[PDB]
Amino acid sequence: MKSLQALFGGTFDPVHYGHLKPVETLANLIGLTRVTIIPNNVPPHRPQPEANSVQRKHMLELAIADKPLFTLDERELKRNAPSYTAQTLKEWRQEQGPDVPLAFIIGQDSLLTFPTWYEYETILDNAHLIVCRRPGYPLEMAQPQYQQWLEDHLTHNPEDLHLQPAGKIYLAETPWFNISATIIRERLQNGESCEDLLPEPVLTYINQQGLYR
Amino acid sequence: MKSLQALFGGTFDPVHYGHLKPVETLANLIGLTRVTIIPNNVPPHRPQPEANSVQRKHMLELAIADKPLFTLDERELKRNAPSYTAQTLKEWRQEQGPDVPLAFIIGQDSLLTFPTWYEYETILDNAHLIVCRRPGYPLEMAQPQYQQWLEDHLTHNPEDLHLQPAGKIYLAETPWFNISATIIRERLQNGESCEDLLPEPVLTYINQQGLYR
Amino acid sequence: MKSLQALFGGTFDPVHYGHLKPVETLANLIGLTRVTIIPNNVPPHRPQPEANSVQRKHMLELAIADKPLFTLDERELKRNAPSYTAQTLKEWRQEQGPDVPLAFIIGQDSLLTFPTWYEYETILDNAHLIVCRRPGYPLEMAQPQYQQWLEDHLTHNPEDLHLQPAGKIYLAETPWFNISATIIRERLQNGESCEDLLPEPVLTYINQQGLYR
Ligand SMILES: NC(=O)c1ccc[n+]([C@@H]2O[C@H](COP(=O)([O-])OP(=O)(O)OC[C@H]3O[C@@H](n4cnc5c(N)ncnc54)[C@H](O)[C@@H]3O)[C@@H](O)[C@H]2O)c1
Ligand SMILES: NC(=O)c1ccc[n+]([C@@H]2O[C@H](COP(=O)([O-])OP(=O)(O)OC[C@H]3O[C@@H](n4cnc5c(N)ncnc54)[C@H](O)[C@@H]3O)[C@@H](O)[C@H]2O)c1
Ligand SMILES: NC(=O)c1ccc[n+]([C@@H]2O[C@H](COP(=O)([O-])OP(=O)(O)OC[C@H]3O[C@@H](n4cnc5c(N)ncnc54)[C@H](O)[C@@H]3O)[C@@H](O)[C@H]2O)c1
């Protein structure tokens, strides 16, 4: 078993503390020396992002400039066809080999929607799922069958993440943040301060570019 | 519910690691993007501080120059008259509004003396109380009537701090530090090293100013 | 009880993230303002290091240059006679006084071998033992008698480390890392990347010196 690697996907419109901080602590809780962020272009499961692809990428770079834990993989931004996490993870698995523990990080709100993802069942064959807590979201799946799926792959010992290359779901004890890209976009539109919600470099870039206005 | 905001009050004569480190970790444990420190100007529950308001402010700015989590609120500092936490928190609630979760952070030794504070019962109407562990101090209130008050407001699920505006007392699992401003002043008096107890820039300022000797 | 101090010993051939990250997080979990790394030369319990004394020391200074938590103690590299942790801790105890809690940090793999150390029984008379988790290792001593010794000194309350000068063994809940110096040396020799396994500065020095590869 090689060193546990982690990937974190998202649209990040814009990237903010609710995306970053839970993950940074995750690295100290379970042991990650590197987290690859995988931004996407126009995900099917959601409306068009306000900031375009180039701007969202730049904001991510600005945000991790002084945080070596993070790096970017632009495969989904450059992909000509739409991307699917099941596909990106299949690829990562082939590239890294069968002995590299691999984990895909999501927030509690995305775990609730996981069973609706493209070929979701294949994801656990290629990687682990590490879920970060989000305040106020239900902890159990909406439907009984998907709750069973969850319990079927659930582990309470994060050590398991380092001992197998994939297959486990772990609900990490990460910090809570009542922060969303939506609230930030609206605060900016309303002329309310976002100073304590996302990196200064990102905020500054947002204002320089006139984004979300 | 907006983002949980935290306040950290004290005299800081001088600010040292026992003040800062528990709060820095607290931010990563429960989710704080900003902690506003509120230094007072000669409080009623203790004698005059040796360093004056200008010096303690300076030492705090030196201690947090590198720590973006922190910012200062000099409302009690620049005020010559006596200040009371209950009044400060009442003002904070009025200013921030009813939907902002607000927490006032204190150490275990301060929790034990909490029932003697000016109109202490109004504090939980305006904010939550986050208590940082301190080695050696009792965990239970001296008098049963106050242990009951503690028990009636306690929560073991820090997520509560993010879902209600105020009212809970949470005993956080923060790092322990056998450090106090008194030990620091006394060691300086005996010409014993205080390296490892507070920031070097703070110690430098102290010697430059001739403070505590 | 004065402030709890910690010592971290090892060969570090080379120092990597598996050595540092568990310890850095340890400082935030239990409360440590400083950890003194004690590198050794050619200890008898293991073969001769590939990298030499000055090289391993230089790699340590490079790795901690920007991590103020750490400092180096060169006594075991400068000592003429062979070094023994029991002796180094006896000296520390003598130098620090009887009221400083002292802790020596090791990984689970070393704890398993602890009963074979030179005068191992005297170590707990002089300091506490703090153990960092390591994935895949047995949690219990191989022989019942040493497991007895383990259980007899074991505490599940880390506050104990700050209230007594020595005597307890605490198994800290630190991050896991599938990293070893042996795998690094192999990889470098086979020309494979070691980018996410140890500090960039240390990798650079390794290349400059022609080490391992
Ligand atoms: N292949 C598919 O069918 C499919 C369907 C849906 C989503 N996805 C993937 O899931 C990933 C996340 O998509 P998204 O739309 O949620 O991205 P997003 O940009 O909204 O959020 C990024 C991540 O941060 C988490 N997060 C956001 N705010 C948080 C907060 N305040 N606290 C804690 N965590 C928080 C989200 O749950 C998500 O995992 C992407 O990689 C996306 O491609 C794939
Ligand atoms: N309004 C009132 O009647 C009243 C009465 C007492 C205190 N207070 C307020 O309570 C706050 C704390 O005052 P103080 O005199 O104790 O301030 P202080 O400067 O001594 O300490 C600041 C904070 O650090 C905590 N702390 C100190 N050393 C610590 C350590 N080693 N580990 C963990 N925590 C540690 C203290 O308990 C306190 O909450 C101030 O805002 C003060 O005004 C108000
Ligand atoms: N005095 C004696 O008789 C005696 C006998 C054996 C060892 N020792 C001492 O024990 C200390 C450790 O020696 P070593 O040979 O194991 O040093 P090392 O350089 O191999 O490792 C340094 C420390 O890091 C820990 N570690 C390494 N990889 C880790 C990982 N991936 N995750 C978590 N922890 C990890 C090790 O267990 C050890 O405590 C040294 O101070 C050595 O002198 C003393």
Short mmCIF file of C-alpha atoms and ligand atoms in Angstrom, two decimals, chain C residues 8-20 22-23 38-40 43-46 76 83-87 104-111 113-114 116-120 123 130 132-135 137 174-181, ligand 3:
data_model
loop_
_atom_site.label_atom_id
_atom_site.label_comp_id
_atom_site.label_asym_id
_atom_site.label_seq_id
_atom_site.Cartn_x
_atom_site.Cartn_y
_atom_site.Cartn_z
CA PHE C 8 11.60 13.53 19.11
CA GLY C 9 14.50 11.16 18.38
CA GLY C 10 15.56 9.31 15.27
CA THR C 11 18.00 8.57 12.46
CA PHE C 12 16.02 10.25 9.61
CA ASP C 13 17.72 8.74 6.52
CA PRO C 14 16.09 10.92 5.25
CA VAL C 15 13.61 12.91 7.35
CA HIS C 16 10.19 12.76 5.67
CA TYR C 17 6.52 13.70 6.23
CA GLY C 18 5.85 10.50 8.15
CA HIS C 19 8.25 11.83 10.79
CA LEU C 20 7.10 15.41 10.86
CA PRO C 22 2.28 13.34 13.05
CA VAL C 23 4.36 15.42 15.44
CA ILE C 38 17.36 14.56 18.59
CA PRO C 39 19.06 12.97 15.56
CA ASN C 40 21.52 10.13 16.23
CA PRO C 43 22.82 3.53 16.77
CA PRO C 44 23.35 -0.25 17.20
CA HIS C 45 19.74 -1.31 16.73
CA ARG C 46 19.96 -0.64 13.00
CA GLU C 76 23.77 12.50 20.37
CA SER C 83 24.14 7.28 22.79
CA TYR C 84 21.19 5.78 24.64
CA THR C 85 17.78 7.41 24.87
CA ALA C 86 17.65 6.46 28.55
CA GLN C 87 20.81 8.47 29.13
CA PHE C 104 9.63 11.54 24.36
CA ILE C 105 7.78 10.88 21.09
CA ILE C 106 7.97 7.66 19.03
CA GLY C 107 5.84 5.92 16.43
CA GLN C 108 3.78 2.78 17.09
CA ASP C 109 6.49 0.66 15.40
CA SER C 110 9.07 1.80 17.96
CA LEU C 111 6.77 1.29 20.92
CA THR C 113 10.39 -2.56 20.25
CA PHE C 114 10.64 -0.44 23.39
CA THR C 116 14.56 -4.02 24.05
CA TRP C 117 16.01 -0.53 24.64
CA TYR C 118 18.99 0.14 26.92
CA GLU C 119 17.63 0.38 30.46
CA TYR C 120 14.13 1.01 29.08
CA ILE C 123 12.77 6.15 30.72
CA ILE C 130 3.81 9.78 23.62
CA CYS C 132 2.07 8.39 17.22
CA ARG C 133 -0.09 6.05 15.16
CA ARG C 134 1.35 4.17 12.21
CA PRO C 135 -0.97 2.30 9.83
CA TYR C 137 1.06 -2.03 13.02
CA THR C 174 -2.32 11.41 15.03
CA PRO C 175 -2.58 11.32 11.22
CA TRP C 176 -1.46 8.15 9.39
CA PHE C 177 1.18 7.99 6.68
CA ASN C 178 2.25 5.09 4.47
CA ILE C 179 5.76 6.52 4.26
CA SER C 180 9.18 5.11 5.21
CA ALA C 181 12.72 6.24 4.50
N1 LIG D 3 18.38 3.70 23.68
C1 LIG D 3 18.10 2.55 23.01
O1 LIG D 3 18.49 1.42 23.37
C2 LIG D 3 17.27 2.54 21.77
C3 LIG D 3 16.91 1.33 20.98
C4 LIG D 3 16.06 1.60 19.76
C5 LIG D 3 15.68 2.86 19.44
N2 LIG D 3 16.01 4.02 20.19
C6 LIG D 3 15.59 5.40 19.85
O2 LIG D 3 14.24 5.47 19.39
C7 LIG D 3 14.14 6.63 18.50
C8 LIG D 3 13.50 6.23 17.17
O3 LIG D 3 14.46 5.38 16.46
P1 LIG D 3 14.11 4.80 14.99
O4 LIG D 3 15.18 3.87 14.58
O5 LIG D 3 12.75 4.18 14.86
O6 LIG D 3 14.16 6.24 14.24
P2 LIG D 3 13.60 6.62 12.79
O7 LIG D 3 14.49 7.65 12.27
O8 LIG D 3 13.42 5.44 11.90
O9 LIG D 3 12.14 7.25 13.02
C9 LIG D 3 12.00 8.42 13.88
C10 LIG D 3 10.65 8.25 14.56
O10 LIG D 3 9.58 8.35 13.60
C11 LIG D 3 8.64 7.34 13.77
N3 LIG D 3 8.10 7.12 12.45
C12 LIG D 3 8.80 6.76 11.31
N4 LIG D 3 8.03 6.65 10.22
C13 LIG D 3 6.76 6.96 10.72
C14 LIG D 3 5.50 7.03 10.09
N5 LIG D 3 5.31 6.80 8.79
N6 LIG D 3 4.40 7.37 10.86
C15 LIG D 3 4.59 7.61 12.19
N7 LIG D 3 5.74 7.57 12.86
C16 LIG D 3 6.79 7.23 12.08
C17 LIG D 3 9.51 6.19 14.29
O11 LIG D 3 8.75 5.18 14.97
C18 LIG D 3 10.42 6.91 15.26
O12 LIG D 3 9.84 7.13 16.56
C19 LIG D 3 15.56 7.22 18.40
O13 LIG D 3 15.75 8.31 19.31
C20 LIG D 3 16.43 6.03 18.79
O14 LIG D 3 17.73 6.43 19.24
C21 LIG D 3 16.80 3.84 21.34
#
